Amino acid sequence: LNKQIKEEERNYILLENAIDNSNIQGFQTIQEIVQLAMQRMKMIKEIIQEENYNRIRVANKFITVAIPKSDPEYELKNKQQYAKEVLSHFLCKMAYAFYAEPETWLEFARAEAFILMDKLKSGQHHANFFSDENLKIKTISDELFKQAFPKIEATFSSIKIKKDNFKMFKFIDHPSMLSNNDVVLHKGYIIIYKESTSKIVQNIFIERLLDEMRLLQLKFQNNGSKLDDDRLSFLKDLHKA
Amino acid sequence: QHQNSNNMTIVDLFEQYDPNKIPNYLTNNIDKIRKHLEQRILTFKIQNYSQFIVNEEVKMVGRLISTENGFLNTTNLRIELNRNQYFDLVFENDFDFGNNVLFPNQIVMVKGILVVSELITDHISQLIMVAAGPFSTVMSTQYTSFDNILHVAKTKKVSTLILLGPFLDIKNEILKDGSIIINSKEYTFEQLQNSLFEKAVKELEGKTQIIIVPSTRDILSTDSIPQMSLEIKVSEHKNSIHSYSNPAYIDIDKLRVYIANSDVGMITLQNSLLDKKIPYMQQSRLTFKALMNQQNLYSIYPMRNPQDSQQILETVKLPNINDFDIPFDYQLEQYPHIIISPSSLPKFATKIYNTVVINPNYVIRDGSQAGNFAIITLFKDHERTRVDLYCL
Amino acid sequence: LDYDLLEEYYRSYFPVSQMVQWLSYPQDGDDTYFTRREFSFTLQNEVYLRYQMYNSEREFKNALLQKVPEKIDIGAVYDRPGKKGDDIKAKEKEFVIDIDMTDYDHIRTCCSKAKICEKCWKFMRVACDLISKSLDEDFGFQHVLWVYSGRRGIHAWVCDKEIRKANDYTRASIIDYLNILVDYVKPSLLKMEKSHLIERNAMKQLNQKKAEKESEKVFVEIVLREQNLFMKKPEIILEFLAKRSENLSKEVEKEWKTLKTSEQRYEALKELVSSEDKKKTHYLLEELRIWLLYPRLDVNVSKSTNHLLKSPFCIHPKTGNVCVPFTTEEISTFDPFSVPNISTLTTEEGSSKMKNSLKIFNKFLENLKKDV
Amino acid sequence: SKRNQFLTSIPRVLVDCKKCDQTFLFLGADAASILKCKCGNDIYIQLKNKIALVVKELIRNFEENAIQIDNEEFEYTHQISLVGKAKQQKMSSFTLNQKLLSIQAMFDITKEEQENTQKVTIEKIKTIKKTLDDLLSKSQYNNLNLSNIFTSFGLL
Ligand SMILES: [Zn+2]
After folding, report:
1. Alpha helix (H) ranges present in C180-319?
2. Where, if anywhere, are coiled coils annotated (chain C) (predicted)?
3. Are residues B154 and B240 located together in one domain of the fold?
C-alpha cells in the first residue's frame, strides 16, 4: 500500500512512465483528451514566452489538490490529479518528437525543466535527486580553499565564508559549466556557490530528456506514419497552437 | 397441468454479453475480419476436412466468395485460401454436379488436377405453443389477432407459449407516426408495449410461461441481428415472462430448442445455387443440410436481397456472430432438439440428422387474415415428438 | 629532388622505436596500441596514401624506406584495424593546439609575409609561455610536447591519462576556454565585471594594488612592438580606439601630429586615456594590449576528435627544415636558425645538432615513461 | 459560441403538429426554456417518437458496412475479400459519432437557464437526453483506450 504510493509519487515528480486511463472515471472520451492536451501546451508556450512559475500553475489549476481523508470518494481526487499530470506530459512530448527538428526541441526541454524545479522547491522531499546529487558534489578541501583564495574572492563580490562556498566538482563530469562566468577554475577543478545546485539539476535532466526524443523519433522514422486516424490528425495541431 | 407449469424452470445456455462492454458496438475494422477468417479457415482445415484425405493432384480448403458484385453464376464461383493462394474453379467441363449446396461465405474442400466435400457429420407428455408475428393488421393498430391467439391458447390450456417476431415494426407504425385512441389519449412506443404485455399477462393470468424473441424489424431494438434482451416492463410482478437474444438456444426440462428468428431459410435458398429439377421440399431440405454442417445458420455475410444488389435485408456484425456457433457431433449428443426457422417457405415439419425443424409462417401473412401457427407434443419415458400445424 | 631523400631516409627519422614507445603507453597495460593507430602518407606528385596501418614496426620501416614519403602524418586509434569497411569508430586521440604566423601578418611590417624575420619570432616566444601558463595554471595537464614545423609556427601535442578518451563535446569546451581573441575585441563576458581572472594573468599583470611596476609590465610589449613596427601604422589602433567616443579619437589624432615619435606617442596615449573617466573608459589599455599581442588559436585542425597532423622529424625540400622536438623548458633557449637541414653533409656541427635534438626528445620520452 | 459548429451538421428532424409542420433546429436567440410549437400542444410525444425512429434509422444505415471499389471507383460492395488491398468505408465511424454528438448537444441546457423554470420541463429534458446519453456511453469509438497507442513505443 505505502510502497505503491511511493512509486506513484516517484513517477509523478520524475514523470518518466505512463499509466492507463480506460478505467479512470473522467478522462475516457476523445473530447476530454483534446482540452487536456491543449491546456499543458498553452501553459508551456506562455512560460517560454515570459522570462512567477508558481503563480503560473495556480492559473491552470495544475496544483496537487489538498483534501482531507474524511472526504467521501477520496480515491477519485488523487486518481484524477495523478491522471492529469502523467497523461499531459507524454502527449505533449509525442508531438515534438515526431514533427519538430532537433534544433527545436530545446524549447520544450527548458519549459519542462523549469516546472520541475518549482515542483522540487515546493515539494516536501527532494530525496529522488538528493541521493544522486551526493554522487556529483564533492566537498572542497581546506587545502584547496586557501590555495585559490585570491581567485575565489575575485569573482565573488556581492552577498545576497568557508561554508558559503559549496562542494566542488570534477572537470570531466560537467564540461558544460566552465563557460559560465560565475565559476572559478584551478588546475582542472571547479568551485561553485550552493545556489547553483539547482542549475546542475536542469543540466542532467535536459540532456536525458532531449536524448529520448531522438530515440523516440528514431523508433518512428523507420515507419511511415501513425496508423490510427483519430490521433494522427490530432497530434499535428499540437505544434503551432 | 398446473403443477406442470409450476415445475417449468426455464433456462438458457448462451453466455450473454454484459450490456456495458459490447466488444464492437460501433467501431468496425477490415483487418480484424481478415485475421478472424484466416484463423477460422485453419480451424476447419485442422478439425474437420483432415479426416477424409491423406496427403498429379492438389487438395485444399477455402472460402467461397463471388468474383463479381452481381449475383453468382456457375462460371464465376471462386475459391480462396489465404493471403497468397488465390485461384479459380473450372469443374464445369463435364457438367457433373453432386448433391451439395454452394453459397457465398461457405468453406468447402475441393481437390482436383474435381471432387467436393461439404464437411459431413457422421450419420446417427407435454404440449408447447408457438406463435409468429406480426400481431397487427397492415395499416391498422388494433392488434385484434393477439386477442384470438390468446383465446385459442387459453382454450387449449397449453403449458407454455412462445411469442416471436416483430411487435412494433417499421412497416406499420411509420404510416401512423403517432398513437391516438378512442378515449382521447396519446400513447408512445413503450406505453403501447406495456399495454400489450399487460393484456397478455392478464389474459393468461400467469398460469403459463411465455417466451419472447425480438427481431430486427422491431422499432424499439436498434441493435443488429445478434441483438439481445429486448427489455420488458410489466405491471404484473410474477416471473412468467422472459426475454432472450436473437439466435436463442433454450433449455426446457429436458428439451433444447434453437431459434433462428429471422428469414434465414428463404435467403439461404434463393441466394445460393443448386441443381434444377429438384422439388421445393427437397430444395429446403438440402439448404438446411448445408447450413447445419457449418455449425451456424447465419453463414452468409452479404445476404443481399434477391434481384436487388443495393438493398440488404438484414445487417450482420461479422466479428461478433461466430460466438453463437454450436457444433454438431452426434457421437456424443444430439444438441439441437428442435429448430424454429420462421420464414416465407411453405409450411413443413420434418426430421434431419435425428432432429426436427418446423416453419410456422407469419400470422396475418401479406396482409391477409389467413394466419397460421403450429403446436408440438412430445412424450418422455427416447425422443418421440408429435407435430401438427394449424391454419386460421 | 627525391634521390637525396631516398638515400637519406636511413638517417632522417631515427626515433622509430622512440615513436613506437611514445604511442605504446605501456602503463595502461593494453596491447596493440600501435596496431590501431591511424597513419597517412604523401607520395611524389599528389599521390596520397591513407590508412597505411602497420601492425609490425619492421614492415613499417621497410615501407617507409622503400617509398618516398615526403610527408608523414599521425592519426587516431580506432576500434579495430582495417580500412574503408565496417565503418570503424575511433576510441582515442591526443589533444592538439596549432599556432601560425598568418594571424600576425596584419600587425608586422618588416617582413615580406613569405619568409620570417628575427624581429617576428618574439611573438611566438611570448605565445608559447602564455599558452603553457594557461594550461598549467587552469588545468592539470602534467605533460606537454611542442613541435616546430617547416617555415612557420609550431603545434602543441599533449599526452595525458584522461583527455585521450575525452569526447568531442569536452574538446570543444576546453578549446572554448583558451580562446579569448574573439572575432573584433575581447568578448563582453569578461568586460562586464571587474576583478576578473583569466586575461589579467594573460597580460602578465599579477595581483597588484607604481612607475617600476608599470615599466616592468610594459617593457615586454615595448620590446616586441616599438622595434618591429613602432606605431608606423596609426590607423590600425585608431580603428580600435574609434570603438570609444569620437572625442577621444579626435583628441589623440590631434595630439599625435606633433610628437612624431613612437614611444612618446604611446606614453601620450596612456596619459590621455589614464584619467578621462571612471566608467566610460575601462581596461582600455588591457584590451588594446591583448588584441595587439595575444595569438589567435586555430580551431580548424584541432576541432574534430579525429584528424591528421604533420609528424615530428618530417622533411620537405622546399624550405629545408627539420621539425625538431621541443619542451616547455626549451622556450627560453630555442632558436629557429640552428635547426639541422638536408644541406649539411659530413659535417660535425649538424651531427651535434641532431644529437641534441634526439637528447631533448628523449628527455621528455623517459620523463613520460617514468611519470606515466 | 459552441452551438454553431453543432448546428452545421444536425440531421433532419421534422415534427408533424396540428395544422403545421416545422423543422426542429432546437438550441440550448432561441428560447430554450420552452420547447412547444406555436400551438398550445407541447409536441413532446411526437418529438420523442421521431428521435427514436431517426436514431434507429441512423444505426441501421451504419451497420450495413460497404467498402469502396479499388481502381479509384466510387462504386461500393458489401462483399469483402481476403486479398483486398483497398480499405475505405462508405460511412466511417467518425461521421456517425459526430452526428450522434450533434443530436445530443442540440438538446442540452446550461445550469443557469434551468433554475428559472419549472421542474417538469427540465426533468422531461433530461428524460429525453438520457436516451441518447446512454447510447453514447456504450460506443467503442467515443470511449478511447489509449494504452496500445503508445505502449508499442516502449512506455508502461
Ligand atoms: Zn403547431
Report:
1. 188-191, 198-202, 211-225, 234-241, 246-259, 262-274, 284-293
2. 196-219
3. yes
Cα separations (Å) of B270 from B65, B78, B102, B371? 16, 19, 11, 24
Nearest to A101 by CA among A233, A235, A213, A234: A213
Question: Measured between alpha carbons, how far is C202 from A83 in angstroms, rounded to an integer?
Answer: 57
- Mutation choice for D interface testing from A230, A233, A234, A235 by most D CBs within 10 A: A230
Look at residue B174 and tell me if it is in a domain.
yes
Nearest-Å Rg of the Cα atoms of chain D is 20
- Please report, in angstroms and rounded to a whole number, the separation of the first and last CA atoms in chain B: 26
Residue extents of the structural domains in chain A: 2-112+198-237, 133-192
**Chain B partners within 8 Å of D135 (Cβ):** 222
C98 is catalytic: yes
Please state whether beta strands B160-164 and B209-213 pair in parallel, antiparallel, or not at all (unpaired).
parallel
Distance CA A172, CA C162 (A): 9
Q: Do chains D and B touch (3 or more CB pairs under 8 A)?
A: yes
As a whole number of angstroms, the distance between CA D81 and CA B34 comes to 8
B96 in any annotated domain? yes
- Cβ–Cβ gap B69/D93 under 8 Å: no
Whole-angstrom Cα distance, residue B343 to residue D113?
A: 54
Q: What are phi and psi of C89, to 5 degrees?
A: -90, 140
C-alpha cell at D132: 441518447
Q: Which amino acid is at B190?
A: E
- DSSP single-letter state for residue B367: G
Residues C264, C279: contact at Cβ < 8 Å?
no
